[PDB]
Coordinates of C-alpha atoms in Angstrom, one line a residue:
Chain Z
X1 CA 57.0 121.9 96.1
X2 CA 59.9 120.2 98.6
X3 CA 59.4 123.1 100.4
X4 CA 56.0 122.3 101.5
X5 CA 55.5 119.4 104.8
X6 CA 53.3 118.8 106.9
X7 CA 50.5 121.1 108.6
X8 CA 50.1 121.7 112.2
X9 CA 48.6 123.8 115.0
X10 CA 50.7 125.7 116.6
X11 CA 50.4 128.8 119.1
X12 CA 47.1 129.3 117.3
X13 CA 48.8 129.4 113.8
X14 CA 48.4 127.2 111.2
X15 CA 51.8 126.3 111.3
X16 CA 54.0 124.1 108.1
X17 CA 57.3 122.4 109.0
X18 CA 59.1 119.3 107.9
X19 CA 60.0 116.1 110.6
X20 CA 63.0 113.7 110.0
X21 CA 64.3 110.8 111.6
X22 CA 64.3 109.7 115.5
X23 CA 65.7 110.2 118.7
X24 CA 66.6 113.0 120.3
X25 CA 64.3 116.1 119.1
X26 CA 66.9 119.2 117.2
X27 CA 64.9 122.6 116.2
X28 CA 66.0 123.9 113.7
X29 CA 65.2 127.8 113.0
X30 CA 65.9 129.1 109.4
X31 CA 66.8 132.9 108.6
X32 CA 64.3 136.1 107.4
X33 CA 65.9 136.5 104.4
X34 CA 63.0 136.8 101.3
X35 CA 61.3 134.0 100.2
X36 CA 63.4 132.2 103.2
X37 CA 61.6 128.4 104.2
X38 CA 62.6 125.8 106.8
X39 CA 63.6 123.6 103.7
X40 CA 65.4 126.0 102.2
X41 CA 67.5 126.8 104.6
X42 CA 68.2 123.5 106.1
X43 CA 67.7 121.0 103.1
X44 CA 71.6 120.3 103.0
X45 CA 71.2 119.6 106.8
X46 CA 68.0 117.2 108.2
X47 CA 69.5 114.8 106.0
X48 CA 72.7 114.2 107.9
X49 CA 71.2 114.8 111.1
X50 CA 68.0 112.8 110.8
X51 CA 70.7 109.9 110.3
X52 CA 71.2 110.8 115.0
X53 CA 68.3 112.7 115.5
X54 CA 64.6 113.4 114.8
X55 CA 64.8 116.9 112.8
X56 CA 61.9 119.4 113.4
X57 CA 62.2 122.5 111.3
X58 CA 58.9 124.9 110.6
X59 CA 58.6 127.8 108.7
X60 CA 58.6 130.7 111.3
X61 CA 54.9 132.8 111.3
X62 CA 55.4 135.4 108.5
X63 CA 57.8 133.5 106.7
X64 CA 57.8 130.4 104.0
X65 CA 54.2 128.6 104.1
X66 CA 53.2 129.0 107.7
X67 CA 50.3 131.3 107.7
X68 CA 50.1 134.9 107.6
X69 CA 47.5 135.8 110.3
X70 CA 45.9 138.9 109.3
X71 CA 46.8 141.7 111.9
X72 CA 49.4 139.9 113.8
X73 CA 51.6 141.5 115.9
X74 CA 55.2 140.8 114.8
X75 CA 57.7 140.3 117.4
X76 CA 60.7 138.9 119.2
X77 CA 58.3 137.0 121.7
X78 CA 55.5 136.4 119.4
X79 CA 57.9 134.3 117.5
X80 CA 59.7 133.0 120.6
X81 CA 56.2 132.1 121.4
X82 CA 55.4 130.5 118.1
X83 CA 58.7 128.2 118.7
X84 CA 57.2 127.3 122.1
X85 CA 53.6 126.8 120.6
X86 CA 55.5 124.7 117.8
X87 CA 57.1 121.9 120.1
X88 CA 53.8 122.0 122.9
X89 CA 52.0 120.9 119.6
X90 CA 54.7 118.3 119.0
X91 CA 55.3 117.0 123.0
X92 CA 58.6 118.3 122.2
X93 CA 59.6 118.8 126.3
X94 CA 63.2 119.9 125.7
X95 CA 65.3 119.9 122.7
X96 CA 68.6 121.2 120.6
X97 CA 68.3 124.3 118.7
X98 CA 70.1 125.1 116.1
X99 CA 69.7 128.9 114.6
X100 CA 70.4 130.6 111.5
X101 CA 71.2 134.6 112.2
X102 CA 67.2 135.6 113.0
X103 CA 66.9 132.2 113.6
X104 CA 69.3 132.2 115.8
X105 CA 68.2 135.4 117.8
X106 CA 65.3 134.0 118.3
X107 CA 67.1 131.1 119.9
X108 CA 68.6 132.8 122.4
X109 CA 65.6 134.6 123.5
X110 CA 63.6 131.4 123.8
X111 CA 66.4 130.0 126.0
X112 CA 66.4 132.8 128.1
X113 CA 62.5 133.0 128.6
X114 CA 62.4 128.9 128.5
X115 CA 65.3 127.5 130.0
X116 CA 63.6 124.5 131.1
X117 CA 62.9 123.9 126.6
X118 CA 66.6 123.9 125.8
X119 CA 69.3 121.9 126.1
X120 CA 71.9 122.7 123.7
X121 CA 72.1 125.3 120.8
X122 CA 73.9 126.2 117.5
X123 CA 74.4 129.6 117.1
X124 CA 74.9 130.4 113.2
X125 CA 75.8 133.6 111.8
X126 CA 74.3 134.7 114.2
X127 CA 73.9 138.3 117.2
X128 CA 73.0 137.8 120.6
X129 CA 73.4 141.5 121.4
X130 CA 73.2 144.6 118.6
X131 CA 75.6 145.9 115.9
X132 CA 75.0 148.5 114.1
X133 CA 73.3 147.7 110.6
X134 CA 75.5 146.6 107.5
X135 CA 75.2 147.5 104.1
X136 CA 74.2 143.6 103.3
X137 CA 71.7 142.8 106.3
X138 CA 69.9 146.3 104.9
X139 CA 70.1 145.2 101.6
X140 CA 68.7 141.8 102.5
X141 CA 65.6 143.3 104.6
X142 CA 65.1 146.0 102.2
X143 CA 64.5 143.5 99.0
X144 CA 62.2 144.0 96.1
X145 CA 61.3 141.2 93.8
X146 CA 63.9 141.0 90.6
X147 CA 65.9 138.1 89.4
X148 CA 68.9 140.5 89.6
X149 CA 68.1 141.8 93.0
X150 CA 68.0 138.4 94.2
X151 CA 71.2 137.2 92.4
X152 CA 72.6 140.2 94.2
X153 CA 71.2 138.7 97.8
X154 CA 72.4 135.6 97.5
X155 CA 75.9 137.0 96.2
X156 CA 75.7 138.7 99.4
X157 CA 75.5 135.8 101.4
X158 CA 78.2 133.4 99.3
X159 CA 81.4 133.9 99.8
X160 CA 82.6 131.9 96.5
X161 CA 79.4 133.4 94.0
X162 CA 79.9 130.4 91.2
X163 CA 77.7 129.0 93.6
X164 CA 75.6 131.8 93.0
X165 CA 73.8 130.6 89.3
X166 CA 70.5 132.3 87.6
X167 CA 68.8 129.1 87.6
X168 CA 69.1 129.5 91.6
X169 CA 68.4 133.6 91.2
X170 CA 65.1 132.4 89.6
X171 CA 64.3 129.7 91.7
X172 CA 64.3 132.2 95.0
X173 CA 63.2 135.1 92.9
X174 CA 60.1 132.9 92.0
X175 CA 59.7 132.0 95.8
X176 CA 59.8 135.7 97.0
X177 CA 57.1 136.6 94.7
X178 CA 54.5 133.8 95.6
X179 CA 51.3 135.0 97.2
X180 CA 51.5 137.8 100.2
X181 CA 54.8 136.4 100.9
X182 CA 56.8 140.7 99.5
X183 CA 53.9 141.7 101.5
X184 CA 54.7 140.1 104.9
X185 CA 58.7 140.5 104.5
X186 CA 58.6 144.3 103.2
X187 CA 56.4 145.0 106.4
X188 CA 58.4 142.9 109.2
X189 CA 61.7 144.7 108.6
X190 CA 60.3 148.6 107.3
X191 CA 63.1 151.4 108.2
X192 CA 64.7 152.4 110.2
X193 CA 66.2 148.9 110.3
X194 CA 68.5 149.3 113.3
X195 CA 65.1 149.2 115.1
X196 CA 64.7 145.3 114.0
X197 CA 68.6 144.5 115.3
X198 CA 68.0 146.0 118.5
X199 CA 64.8 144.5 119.0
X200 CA 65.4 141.0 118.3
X201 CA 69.1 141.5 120.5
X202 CA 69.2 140.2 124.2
X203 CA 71.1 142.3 127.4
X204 CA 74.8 141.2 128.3
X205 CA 73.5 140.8 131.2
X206 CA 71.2 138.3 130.4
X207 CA 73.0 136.2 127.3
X208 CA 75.6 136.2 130.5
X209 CA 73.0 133.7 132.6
X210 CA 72.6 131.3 130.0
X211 CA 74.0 127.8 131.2
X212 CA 73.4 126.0 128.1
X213 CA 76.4 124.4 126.0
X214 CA 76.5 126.5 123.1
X215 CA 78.4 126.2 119.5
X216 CA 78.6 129.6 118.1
X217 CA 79.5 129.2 114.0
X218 CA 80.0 132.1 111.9
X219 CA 81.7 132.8 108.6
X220 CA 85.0 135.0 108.2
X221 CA 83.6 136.6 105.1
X222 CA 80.3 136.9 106.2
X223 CA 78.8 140.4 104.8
X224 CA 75.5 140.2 106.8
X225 CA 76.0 140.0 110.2
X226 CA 79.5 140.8 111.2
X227 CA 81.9 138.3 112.7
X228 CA 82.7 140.3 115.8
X229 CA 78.7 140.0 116.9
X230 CA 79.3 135.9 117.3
X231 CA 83.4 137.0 118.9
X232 CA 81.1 138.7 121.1
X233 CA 78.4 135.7 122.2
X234 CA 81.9 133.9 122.7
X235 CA 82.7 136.3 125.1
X236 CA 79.2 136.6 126.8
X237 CA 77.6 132.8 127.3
X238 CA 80.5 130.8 129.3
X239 CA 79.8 127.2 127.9
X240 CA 80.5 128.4 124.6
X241 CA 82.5 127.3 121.8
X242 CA 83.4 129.5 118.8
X243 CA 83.7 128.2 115.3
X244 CA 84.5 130.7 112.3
X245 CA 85.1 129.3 109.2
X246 CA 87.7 131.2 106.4
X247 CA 86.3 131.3 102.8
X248 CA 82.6 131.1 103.9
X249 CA 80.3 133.9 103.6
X250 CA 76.7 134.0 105.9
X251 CA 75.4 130.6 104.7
X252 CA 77.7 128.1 106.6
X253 CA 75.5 125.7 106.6
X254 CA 75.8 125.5 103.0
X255 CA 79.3 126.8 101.6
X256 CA 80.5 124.5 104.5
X257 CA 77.9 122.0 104.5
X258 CA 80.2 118.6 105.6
X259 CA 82.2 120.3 108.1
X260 CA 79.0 122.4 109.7
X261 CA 77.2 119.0 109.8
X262 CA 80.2 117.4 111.5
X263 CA 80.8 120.0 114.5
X264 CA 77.2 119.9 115.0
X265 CA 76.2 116.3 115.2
X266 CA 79.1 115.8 117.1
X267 CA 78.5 118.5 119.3
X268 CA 74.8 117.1 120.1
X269 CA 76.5 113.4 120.9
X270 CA 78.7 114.6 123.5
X271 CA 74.8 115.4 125.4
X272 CA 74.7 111.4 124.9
Chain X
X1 CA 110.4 107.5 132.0
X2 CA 107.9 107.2 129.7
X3 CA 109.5 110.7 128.4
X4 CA 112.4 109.4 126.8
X5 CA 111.6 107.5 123.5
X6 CA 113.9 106.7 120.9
X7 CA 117.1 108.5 119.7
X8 CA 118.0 109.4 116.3
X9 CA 120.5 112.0 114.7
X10 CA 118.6 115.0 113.2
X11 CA 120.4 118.2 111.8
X12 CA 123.9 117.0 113.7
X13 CA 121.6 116.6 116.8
X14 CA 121.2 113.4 119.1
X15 CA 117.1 113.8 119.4
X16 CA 114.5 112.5 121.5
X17 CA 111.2 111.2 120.1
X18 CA 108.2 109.4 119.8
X19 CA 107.1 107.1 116.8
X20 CA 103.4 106.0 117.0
X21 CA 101.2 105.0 114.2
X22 CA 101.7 104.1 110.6
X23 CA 99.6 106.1 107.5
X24 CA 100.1 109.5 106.1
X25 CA 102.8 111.3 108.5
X26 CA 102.1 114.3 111.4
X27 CA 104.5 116.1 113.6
X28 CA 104.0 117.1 116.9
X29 CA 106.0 120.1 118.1
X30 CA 105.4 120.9 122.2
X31 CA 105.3 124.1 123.8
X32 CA 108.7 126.1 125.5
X33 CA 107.9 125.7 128.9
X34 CA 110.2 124.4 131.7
X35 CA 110.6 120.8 131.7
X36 CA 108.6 120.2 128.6
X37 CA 109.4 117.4 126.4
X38 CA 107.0 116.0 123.5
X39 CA 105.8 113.6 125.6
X40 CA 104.6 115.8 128.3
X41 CA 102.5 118.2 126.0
X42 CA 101.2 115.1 123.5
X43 CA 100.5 112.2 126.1
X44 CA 96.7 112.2 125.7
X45 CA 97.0 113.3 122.2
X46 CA 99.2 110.6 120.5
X47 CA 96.9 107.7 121.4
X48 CA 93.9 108.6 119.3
X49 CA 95.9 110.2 116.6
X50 CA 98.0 107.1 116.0
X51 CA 94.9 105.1 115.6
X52 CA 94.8 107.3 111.9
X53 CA 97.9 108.5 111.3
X54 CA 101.8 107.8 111.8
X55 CA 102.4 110.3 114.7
X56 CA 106.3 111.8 115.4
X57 CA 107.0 113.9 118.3
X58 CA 110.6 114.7 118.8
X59 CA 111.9 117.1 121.8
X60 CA 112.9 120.3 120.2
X61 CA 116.8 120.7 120.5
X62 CA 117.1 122.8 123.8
X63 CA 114.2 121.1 125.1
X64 CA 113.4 117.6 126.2
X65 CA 115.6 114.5 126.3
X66 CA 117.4 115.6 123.1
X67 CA 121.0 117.2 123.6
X68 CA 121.6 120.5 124.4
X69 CA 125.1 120.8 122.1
X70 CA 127.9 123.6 123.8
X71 CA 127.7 126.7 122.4
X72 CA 124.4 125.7 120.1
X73 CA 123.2 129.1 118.6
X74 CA 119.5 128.9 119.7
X75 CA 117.0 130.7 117.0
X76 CA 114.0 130.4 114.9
X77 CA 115.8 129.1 111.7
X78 CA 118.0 127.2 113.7
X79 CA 114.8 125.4 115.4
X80 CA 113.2 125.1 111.6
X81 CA 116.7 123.2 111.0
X82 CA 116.1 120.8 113.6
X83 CA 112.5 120.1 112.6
X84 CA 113.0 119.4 109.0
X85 CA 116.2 118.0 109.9
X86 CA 113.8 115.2 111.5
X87 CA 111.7 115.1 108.7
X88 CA 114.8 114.3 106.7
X89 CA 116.4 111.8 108.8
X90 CA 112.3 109.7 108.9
X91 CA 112.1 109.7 105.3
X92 CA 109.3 112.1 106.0
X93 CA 109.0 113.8 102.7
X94 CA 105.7 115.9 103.6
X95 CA 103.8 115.6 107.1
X96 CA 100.7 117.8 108.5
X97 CA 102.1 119.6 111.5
X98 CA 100.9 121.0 115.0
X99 CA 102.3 123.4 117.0
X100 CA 101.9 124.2 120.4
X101 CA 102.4 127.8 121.0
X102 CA 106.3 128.2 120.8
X103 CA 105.4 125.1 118.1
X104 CA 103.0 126.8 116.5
X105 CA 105.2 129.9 115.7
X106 CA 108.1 126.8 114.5
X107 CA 105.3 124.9 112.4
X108 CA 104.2 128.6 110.6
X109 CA 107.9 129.5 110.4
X110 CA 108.9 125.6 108.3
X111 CA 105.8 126.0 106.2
X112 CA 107.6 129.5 104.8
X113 CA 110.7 128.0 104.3
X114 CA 109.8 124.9 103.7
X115 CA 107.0 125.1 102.1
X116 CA 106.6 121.6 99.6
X117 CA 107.3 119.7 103.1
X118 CA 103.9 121.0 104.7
X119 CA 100.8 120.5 104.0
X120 CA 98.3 121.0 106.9
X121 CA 98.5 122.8 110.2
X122 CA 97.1 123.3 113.6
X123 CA 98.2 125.7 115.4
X124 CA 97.1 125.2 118.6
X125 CA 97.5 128.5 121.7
X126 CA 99.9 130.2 119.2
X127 CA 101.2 133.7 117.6
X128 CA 102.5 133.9 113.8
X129 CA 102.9 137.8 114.4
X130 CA 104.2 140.1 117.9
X131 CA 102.2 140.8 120.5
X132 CA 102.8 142.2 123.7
X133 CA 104.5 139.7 126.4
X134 CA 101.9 138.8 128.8
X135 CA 102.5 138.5 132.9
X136 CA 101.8 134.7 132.4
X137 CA 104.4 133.8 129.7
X138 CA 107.1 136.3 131.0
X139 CA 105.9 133.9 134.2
X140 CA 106.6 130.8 132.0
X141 CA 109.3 131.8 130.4
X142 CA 111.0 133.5 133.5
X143 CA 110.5 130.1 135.9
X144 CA 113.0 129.0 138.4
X145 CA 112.7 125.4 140.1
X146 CA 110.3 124.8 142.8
X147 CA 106.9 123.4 143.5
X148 CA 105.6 126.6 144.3
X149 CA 106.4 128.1 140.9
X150 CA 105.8 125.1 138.9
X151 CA 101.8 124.8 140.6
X152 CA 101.8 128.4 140.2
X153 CA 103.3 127.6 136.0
X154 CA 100.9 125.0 136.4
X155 CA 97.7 127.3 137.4
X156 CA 98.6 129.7 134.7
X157 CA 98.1 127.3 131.9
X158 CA 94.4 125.8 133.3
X159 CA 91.3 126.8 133.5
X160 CA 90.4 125.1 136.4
X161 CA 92.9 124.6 138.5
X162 CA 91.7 121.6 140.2
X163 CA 93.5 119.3 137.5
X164 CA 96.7 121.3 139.3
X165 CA 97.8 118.5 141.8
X166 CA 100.2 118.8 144.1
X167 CA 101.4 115.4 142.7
X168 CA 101.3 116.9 139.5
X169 CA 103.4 120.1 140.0
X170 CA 105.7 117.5 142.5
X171 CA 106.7 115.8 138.7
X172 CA 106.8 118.4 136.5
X173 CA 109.3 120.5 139.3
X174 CA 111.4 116.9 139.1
X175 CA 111.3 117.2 135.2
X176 CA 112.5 121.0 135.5
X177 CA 115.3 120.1 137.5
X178 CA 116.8 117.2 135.5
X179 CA 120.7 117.6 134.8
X180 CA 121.2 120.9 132.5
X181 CA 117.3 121.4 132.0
X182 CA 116.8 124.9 134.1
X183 CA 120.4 125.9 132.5
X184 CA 119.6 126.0 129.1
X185 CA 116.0 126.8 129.6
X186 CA 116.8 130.1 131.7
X187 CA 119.6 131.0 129.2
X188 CA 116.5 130.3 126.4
X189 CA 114.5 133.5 126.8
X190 CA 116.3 135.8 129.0
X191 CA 114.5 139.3 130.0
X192 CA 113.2 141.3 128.2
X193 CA 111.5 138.4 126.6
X194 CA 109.2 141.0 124.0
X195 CA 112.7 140.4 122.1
X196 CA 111.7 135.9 121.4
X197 CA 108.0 137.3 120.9
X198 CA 109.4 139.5 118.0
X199 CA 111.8 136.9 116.7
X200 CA 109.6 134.0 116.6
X201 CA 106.4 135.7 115.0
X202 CA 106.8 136.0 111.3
X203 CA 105.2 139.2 109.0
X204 CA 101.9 139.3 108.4
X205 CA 103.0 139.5 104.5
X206 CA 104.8 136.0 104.8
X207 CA 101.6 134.8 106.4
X208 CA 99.0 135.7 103.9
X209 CA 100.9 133.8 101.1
X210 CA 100.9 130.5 103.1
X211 CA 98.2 128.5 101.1
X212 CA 97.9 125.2 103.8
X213 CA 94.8 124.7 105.5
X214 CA 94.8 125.4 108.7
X215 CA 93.0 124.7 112.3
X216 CA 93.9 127.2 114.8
X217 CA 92.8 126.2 118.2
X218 CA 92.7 128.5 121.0
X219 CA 91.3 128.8 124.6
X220 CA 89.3 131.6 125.4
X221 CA 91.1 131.8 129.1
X222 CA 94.3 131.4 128.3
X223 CA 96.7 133.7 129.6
X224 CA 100.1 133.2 128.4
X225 CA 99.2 133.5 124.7
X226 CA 96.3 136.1 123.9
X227 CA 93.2 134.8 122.0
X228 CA 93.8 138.2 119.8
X229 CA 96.7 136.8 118.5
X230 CA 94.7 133.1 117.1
X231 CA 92.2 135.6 116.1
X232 CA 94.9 137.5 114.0
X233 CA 96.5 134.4 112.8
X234 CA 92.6 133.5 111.5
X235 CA 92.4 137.2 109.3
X236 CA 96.0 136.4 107.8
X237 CA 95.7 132.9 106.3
X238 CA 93.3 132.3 103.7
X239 CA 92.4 128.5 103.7
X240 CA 91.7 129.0 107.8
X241 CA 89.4 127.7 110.7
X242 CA 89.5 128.9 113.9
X243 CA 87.9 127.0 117.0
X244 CA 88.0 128.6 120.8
X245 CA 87.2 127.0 123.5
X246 CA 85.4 128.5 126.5
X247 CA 86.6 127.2 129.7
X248 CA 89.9 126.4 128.3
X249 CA 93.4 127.5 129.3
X250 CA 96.8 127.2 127.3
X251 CA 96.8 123.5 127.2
X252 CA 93.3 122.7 124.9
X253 CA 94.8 119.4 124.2
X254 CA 94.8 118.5 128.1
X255 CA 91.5 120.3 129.5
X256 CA 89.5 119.2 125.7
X257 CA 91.3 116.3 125.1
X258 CA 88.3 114.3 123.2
X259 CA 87.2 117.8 121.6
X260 CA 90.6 118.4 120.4
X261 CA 91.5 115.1 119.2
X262 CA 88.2 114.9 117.2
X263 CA 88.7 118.0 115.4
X264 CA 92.4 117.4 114.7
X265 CA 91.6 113.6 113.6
X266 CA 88.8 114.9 111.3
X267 CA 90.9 118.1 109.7
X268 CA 93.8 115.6 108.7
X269 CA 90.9 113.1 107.6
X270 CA 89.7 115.6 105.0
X271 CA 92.7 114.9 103.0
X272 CA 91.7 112.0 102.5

């Protein structure tokens, strides 16, 4: 299973998460969609990065093969604090973060409670503050296991669906269903899910006070999280850049893989 | 004067332009502010684009060093005239084009009517459709020669003002002053000026069957064109990117000169 890396200790959780190439550490932070992984997520990435950068991406606690901690308490700074625990374990002082809609929530609220950790980010289809729940994003947090449920999902996510194939649908479906991981997901999101958006959302006032040099990618079509939340971090964090691609749904990072691989290595070298 | 370039005769016109490069063709089209001239707007941009490409800016009729004939009847089609008039006269069968603003509404305008002799875009600051004249272009557009106004023209396009020289507002007030220049450009757009807005844009139905692929560029600051109206432009055309700059004015090319050229080099690149 690709999916699978290495092991490590991290914030007191045994912690799985994949390293590639050298240099100047990048963070990336995959979504919380079911069945979701670091390597699934970012598989069409570390391998053009690693070529500039050393890639760390782990599987977020609750999520992929990062352990399930019996009784833990689910939140925006328990995971901001597992990001933290993952680069103390890895000497990681300060590095790029790239995040993927949660992923990329939870970027912003590490920045904002760790300045000093982060230099630059990559906001991907991603809210900094809240929107009101869509159809999709409740459809994606209120999964069941079902090859056509899943199909569904990821049609949901793709803007051109012949991407969308049942060998994929099973593939995912398959990874949803391994052990505890419906368990987990159909308890970290339970309705009311506006809860979970306005949770996970930072202040205007306080996305406002980040200095970092941010890239803020989102898809025109994207059915998830709606393209005016990342028009809106464009208007909030001042050293911002906004990148919207037409004909890409949520996933950017793989409808749009050579061009989102471009902007953001490139993005990263201006830092030298 | 590094302004004036060569001459050639384009649509019955005696035109100014500049010939840089050799490959696949691209036309530059500058902005419709006083003193403007292809060299002006493109300067910083021609040099790293020419290292790729065979780059052509030419001074729109009306503007520039190319004549201003008596009684010309100034107008969108009669500006789409002159451009592929230019393209005819260069053996330039089909050339990727970028507009600045008053460009950009020329380069959308010649890919409807001329369709087969376009094939991609950037429209950089611009407006396919109306929107309501804003106190910095009726500013622009309502200029009359001296330093003052020109620094204060000057301020209105940039972000940060401190690139606005005294120096550089001295030579830009020289430029607007040259022989004829303030004539035809205050008989160009006279008040009320909503009327050029309205006759430039083209329908949003004419827009949505353009099938180029296209970079729209816009700064988030910029107050003579609206970001709405790039943001509009980006929900019209279907094979569309949009990219906005924070801590950008009017003039991307000028205050992200490396960021712009990249992307621009890259988007033509992708045709290979």
């Amino acid at each position: 299973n690709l999916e699978i890396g290495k092991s490590i200790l991290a914030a007191g959780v045994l912690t799985n998460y994949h390293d590639v190439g050298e240099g100047q550490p990048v963070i990336l932070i995959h979504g919380s969609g079911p069945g979701v992984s670091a390597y699934a997520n970012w598989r069409l990435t570390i391998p053009a990065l690693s070529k500039f950068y050393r890639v760390i991406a782990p599987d977020m606690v609750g999520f992929g093969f990062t352990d399930r901690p019996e009784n833990y308490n689910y939140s925006k700074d328990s995971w901001v604090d597992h990001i933290i625990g993952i680069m103390d374990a890895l000497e990681i002082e300060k590095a790029h973060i790239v995040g993927n809609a949660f992923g990329g929530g939870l970027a912003i609220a590490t920045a904002l409670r760790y300045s000093e950790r982060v230099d630059r980010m990559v906001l991907m289809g991603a809210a900094g503050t809240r929107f009101d729940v869509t159809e999709g994003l409740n459809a994606v947090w209120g999964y069941t296991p079902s090859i056509e449920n899943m199909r569904n999902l990821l049609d949901i996510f793709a803007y051109d669906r012949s991407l969308v194939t049942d060998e994929l649908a099973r593939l995912r479906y398959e990874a949803s269903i391994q052990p505890g991981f419906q368990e987990s997901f159909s308890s970290m999101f339970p309705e009311p899910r506006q809860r979970w958006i306005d949770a996970l959302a930072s202040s205007d006032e306080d996305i406002k006070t980040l200095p970092n040099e941010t890239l803020i990618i989102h898809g025109r079509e994207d059915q998830v999280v709606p393209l005016s939340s990342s028009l809106r971090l464009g208007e909030l964090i001042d050293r911002a850049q906004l990148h919207v691609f037409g004909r890409c749904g949520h996933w950017t990072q793989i409808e749009q893989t050579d061009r989102f691989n471009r902007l953001v290595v490139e993005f990263f070298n201006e830092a030298n």
